[PDB]
Amino acid sequence: AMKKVEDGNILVFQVSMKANKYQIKKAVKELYEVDVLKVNTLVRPNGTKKAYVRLTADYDALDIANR
Amino acid sequence: KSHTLCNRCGRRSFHVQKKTCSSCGYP
Amino acid sequence: AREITDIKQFLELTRRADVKTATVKINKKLNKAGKPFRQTKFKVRGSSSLYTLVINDAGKAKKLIQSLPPTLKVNRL
Amino acid sequence: LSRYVKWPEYVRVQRQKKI
Amino acid sequence: RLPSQVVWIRRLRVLRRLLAKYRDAGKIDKHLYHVLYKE
Amino acid sequence: AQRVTFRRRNPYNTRSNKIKVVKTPGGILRAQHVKKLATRPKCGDCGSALQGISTLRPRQYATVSKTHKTVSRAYGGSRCANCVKERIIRAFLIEEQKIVKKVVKEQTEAAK
Amino acid sequence: KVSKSTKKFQSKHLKHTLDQRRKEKIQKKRIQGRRGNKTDQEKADAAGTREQQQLKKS
RNA sequence: GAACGCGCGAUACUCUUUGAACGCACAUUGCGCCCCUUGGUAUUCCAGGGGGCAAGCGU
RNA sequence: AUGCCUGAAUAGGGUGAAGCCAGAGGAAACUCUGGUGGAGGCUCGCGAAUUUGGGUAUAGUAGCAAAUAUUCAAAUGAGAACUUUGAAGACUGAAGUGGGGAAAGGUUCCACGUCAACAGCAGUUGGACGUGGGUUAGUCGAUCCUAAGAGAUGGUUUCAAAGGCCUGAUUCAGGCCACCAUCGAAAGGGAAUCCGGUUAAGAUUCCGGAACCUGGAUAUGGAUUCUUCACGGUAACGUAACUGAAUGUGGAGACGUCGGCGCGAGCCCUGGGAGGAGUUAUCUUUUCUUCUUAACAGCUUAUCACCCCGGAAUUGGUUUAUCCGGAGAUGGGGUCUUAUGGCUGGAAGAGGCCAGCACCUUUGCUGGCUCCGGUGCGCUUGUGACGGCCCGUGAAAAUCCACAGGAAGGAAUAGUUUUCAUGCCAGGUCGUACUGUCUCCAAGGUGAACAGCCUCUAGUUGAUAGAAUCCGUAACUUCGG
Ligand SMILES: [Zn+2]
């Protein structure tokens, strides 16, 4: 996940099982004040949901991670 | 594989063909 | 992708507001006579397609290069 | 056909008692 | 090697092609061509 | 001499999933699923394929102009030319026969 | 060169097809020597028409 | 009574998904309708939140 | 025992039925000869039987759990027959011991650490134990639709008040229509994504490039030509557009099986040339390998069918297959479907094969070639026009389109329409790791009789171990011009 953050400009988050892509995008935008390009979600074997949030090129994911 | 999980009781007693449970009678 | 033959259409495409860059590609190839020549492809993408103009004449390609806007980023090859 | 649908049951019964 | 049907097809096709070519060239008229076709 | 297989969920040789083998720009053989071929529109009277109408899938007709799926003649795009000609001739002759029969009835009831 | 369909059939269906063919052959051989196995057309010919039956009665 | 979670329920050592179980289906976390409200350019679009849906010829 | 719905399969060798063509006999009928054609209770490898998936009804003794073949050197380790690397031998041999899937399993996938227990010897190994990591979709499926059937409502549409829409200067009045919820397929029907790269473990999902489908609001250009819903051709029909209510229809979806013939693509075979590798006591222009082009987009391309002229026995045309013609043949000239090929964009910048130059290090920089052809009773697959047989004219529905009809609307500081072109925005939930009763892909040489033998690509080395037709003739014989 940190490799994705450093290279692919993708922040990896754990989200609730009741949240869809709209809610994840909106929540990232509100909490971290960044523009989200895309959101890809999967359901992990342990019953939790993982989201890859790719941000717009105007933002650096590493700067948000350090912040 | 004649039986599957029953929603009401959680046992492997829901007959797939009959659509009835042999342990709690669901539904 | 799309191929165009009109030079002024290419220039009009490169003059739009939402244009990023244009690619100039050089190919060394043979003609039916066997004499090798230099062929220039000018590629720029519009809204949803990539328009390519193929020019087999060196002088026409040079004139088109000179006629490009000075504020347009050009990718050589 | 089956035109009896033009009369509901209660109308039919209350007219049958009239006869 | 080559079965019967293939060689028969090739022979009949070449014979018909020659007959049509000869009729179109004027060497054979309609009726002699019609006889040779059936033959 | 490379072997290829299906690229989707269906593992059976059904009509729905049919495979062609193509050589990709990577130099390898790969499978590709082919869609069902489109069927030419047919005349509503004789069942012959309509002339001058493009052959597309049912939902692809919604995206093309009306000239690609009609004919300028009456019943164009539904019935062929010969069927329309028969319809015109038959209608005219039926009308003429009706006129003649009406005249005959008028004459035969005029005796009394 | 053997065709693909031939390979698939010989690997899948050849054995039971041959066994069934043998079973039909054996049953036909057994029934050939028995009495009472006649086709519908043969039985119809044997019974005859209504006129033939009335002649046979007379 | 069951499932999933931290005796308890997202306020988790108020009350998730269910269950007589109730909008409709159900071996699917599937498919709808209604009212109010908020946000993203916004009268149309998209989404989020809250609350709901088991007349007669008779007198 | 009999069913029903929806899929897969129904193969191959031999023989050679009707019908047809041409010869010879006879007044016909009819009988022979050759070819063609390609059929079946044909063969080959009252009773029995009759492929298959999913759905749905009526004593430290016996003994080592048996699936062949292992050997040498090195490394790791306390410890090696069993772990790792290299070499040798051997096995599976595309109908695989090879690469995927449905179902089922549920973390068995990957890494690091470990040998207390388990893998019937051992183990430093693991489908074990401990701690972590890993499955990304508008385009692939589910989701939608109905099938046999099931099943609520008052047994499956029945003596049910079972529902929606439209018109109107404001008067609640009037009018139209018929028929039943729902469930039921990850093999049926169905809108749309490809290539290259990338991980220890993820890919049509991520990254780069490239493109489509559906829905929505809207603007611009053009058309709607005197002001009001456009033209051309005898015709088939063509078009950048070119309004169309109720109502009534038509097409696609959408439908048995077999046979030969024609065409395309992939594989196989093969010539030249440009690279690389092996052998070379002798001979061998020698043996192996690279020379690739995706979805999508533009132009062009058609057998069949149809239209116009014309009017035919001295009967012509014609298929491998005998059918067609005054119900209009032969001939001459055209129209159409774009299936499929060709050129181009995508695109050489990708991939591939080489050579050279940099470093105890992520140590990547540079330069070339990636070209031109042939062949088919060959295998796989798609398609076209036909022919034969069986038979309800060969499942339904969702969905899209079109036709008849003539309601209504359209002009003087932006008339009406926007099936023409360009432009803007968006696409939720669940599965995706790994293996795997039904299923997918499938090289070459010998065999010169399906078979068997050997090998290429790719996988293995698993199983307690040690000791004792063929030689001599002749005639013939292939395509075009
Ligand atoms: Zn017709």
Side-chain angles (χ1 to χ4, degrees):
Chain A
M2 292 299 314
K3 177 193 312 302
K4 275 174 172 278
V5 166
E6 182 65 26
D7 279 316
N9 218 42
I10 295 176
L11 296 177
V12 192
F13 285 115
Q14 182 193 326
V15 293
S16 64
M17 291 295 288
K18 304 184 165 193
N20 44 37
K21 303 197 183 182
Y22 296 122
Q23 282 163 333
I24 297 171
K25 190 179 192 270
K26 194 204 322 293
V28 170
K29 215 190 293 303
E30 290 187 0
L31 292 182
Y32 305 99
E33 291 146 50
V34 292
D35 291 331
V36 170
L37 178 54
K38 201 177 181 181
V39 173
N40 285 12
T41 73
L42 60 93
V43 170
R44 293 198 288 193
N46 56 85
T48 60
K49 189 175 283 178
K50 168 159 60 158
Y52 306 88
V53 174
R54 189 189 183 181
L55 317 172
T56 302
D58 293 76
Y59 297 86
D60 207 28
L62 183 63
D63 291 331
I64 320 297
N66 296 115
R67 186 257 273 172
Chain B
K1 74 202 171 323
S2 301
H3 293 99
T4 180
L5 275 298
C6 181
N7 284 337
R8 186 148 87 181
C9 65
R11 303 189 49 115
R12 174 231 71 200
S13 301
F14 193 82
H15 207 275
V16 300
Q17 293 294 320
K18 284 202 241 193
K19 305 272 189 32
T20 195
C21 181
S22 63
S23 193
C24 70
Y26 192 64
Chain C
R2 300 255 320 162
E3 201 207 329
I4 61 170
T5 300
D6 291 331
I7 306 172
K8 307 199 182 194
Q9 185 180 2
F10 181 81
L11 286 178
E12 177 152 50
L13 278 162
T14 61
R15 267 193 265 119
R16 285 156 151 223
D18 179 31
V19 54
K20 304 292 131 183
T21 187
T23 298
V24 179
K25 173 87 179 80
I26 312 293
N27 302 314
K28 334 302 281 173
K29 48 180 48 177
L30 295 174
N31 49 30
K32 298 187 177 178
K35 174 202 61 83
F37 72 96
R38 172 172 150 151
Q39 168 204 71
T40 313
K41 300 206 183 180
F42 300 86
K43 320 190 199 197
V44 75
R45 73 167 306 106
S47 298
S48 52
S49 296
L50 173 79
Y51 308 93
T52 294
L53 170 67
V54 180
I55 293 183
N56 305 270
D57 265 10
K60 196 160 301 302
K62 178 54 210 172
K63 294 180 176 66
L64 190 42
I65 284 171
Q66 263 304 320
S67 178
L68 293 174
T71 61
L72 182 69
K73 174 62 151 43
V74 174
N75 266 355
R76 310 306 290 223
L77 277 296
Chain D
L1 292 172
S2 66
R3 309 156 292 178
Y4 81 108
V5 298
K6 52 172 191 152
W7 293 5
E9 279 187 16
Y10 82 99
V11 170
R12 176 171 79 240
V13 175
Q14 84 177 344
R15 283 182 205 186
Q16 283 181 325
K17 298 178 55 182
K18 183 184 177 304
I19 305 301
Chain E
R1 310 300 305 122
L2 271 182
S4 298
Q5 195 173 17
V6 182
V7 297
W8 164 254
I9 284 181
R10 295 156 176 252
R11 194 158 56 95
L12 195 46
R13 279 177 181 163
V14 68
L15 283 181
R16 280 165 180 183
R17 194 211 319 297
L18 187 147
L19 280 174
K21 166 174 140 75
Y22 273 10
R23 186 204 41 195
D24 293 331
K27 303 211 212 314
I28 317 166
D29 68 84
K30 297 164 36 181
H31 324 278
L32 185 53
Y33 164 85
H34 207 77
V35 174
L36 293 179
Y37 192 93
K38 302 301 200 70
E39 280 169 344
Chain F
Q2 190 208 319
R3 296 165 270 185
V4 303
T5 187
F6 305 118
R7 289 168 74 177
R8 295 176 185 186
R9 196 197 184 80
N10 200 12
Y12 308 106
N13 197 284
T14 313
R15 179 187 44 165
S16 197
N17 62 340
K18 284 286 168 187
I19 300 299
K20 190 165 44 76
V21 178
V22 298
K23 202 183 291 189
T24 65
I28 68 182
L29 293 168
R30 194 182 312 239
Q32 276 189 351
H33 293 249
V34 302
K35 308 196 202 60
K36 304 208 199 185
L37 281 197
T39 309
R40 300 189 49 169
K42 306 296 196 300
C43 174
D45 280 337
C46 60
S48 56
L50 287 175
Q51 176 167 357
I53 290 154
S54 54
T55 303
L56 304 152
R57 291 299 278 165
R59 207 179 253 280
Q60 301 182 8
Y61 285 114
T63 60
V64 287
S65 45
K66 217 190 203 181
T67 71
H68 286 162
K69 66 181 94 81
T70 48
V71 172
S72 286
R73 184 193 47 255
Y75 288 89
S78 194
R79 267 72 168 197
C80 62
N82 302 336
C83 286
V84 170
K85 174 184 162 191
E86 312 183 355
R87 283 161 154 280
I88 299 159
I89 298 179
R90 175 167 272 116
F92 177 76
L93 292 174
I94 286 186
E95 181 215 329
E96 294 305 86
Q97 171 69 15
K98 278 184 51 174
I99 286 175
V100 173
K101 214 83 191 63
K102 185 70 100 183
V103 176
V104 160
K105 184 177 180 180
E106 271 195 9
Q107 283 204 0
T108 187
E109 302 304 19
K112 300 184 179 184
Chain G
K1 201 186 178 179
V2 176
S3 74
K4 171 206 298 193
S5 64
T6 300
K7 294 180 196 159
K8 288 207 200 153
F9 194 95
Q10 287 176 357
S11 66
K12 279 191 217 157
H13 300 279
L14 194 42
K15 195 202 82 54
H16 81 78
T17 287
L18 290 183
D19 189 358
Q20 182 63 24
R21 194 190 302 164
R22 274 160 211 180
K23 275 207 208 314
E24 321 275 20
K25 204 173 180 254
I26 298 314
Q27 166 85 354
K28 192 62 152 314
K29 165 179 191 255
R30 183 191 271 120
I31 302 300
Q32 261 178 347
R34 195 91 150 171
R35 172 198 62 250
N37 306 281
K38 324 192 51 173
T39 50
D40 300 348
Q41 184 267 344
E42 198 164 341
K43 290 188 286 186
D45 199 355
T49 62
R50 304 161 71 71
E51 289 210 11
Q52 283 189 3
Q53 291 175 11
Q54 263 154 210
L55 283 170
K56 295 191 69 165
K57 183 153 291 163
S58 64

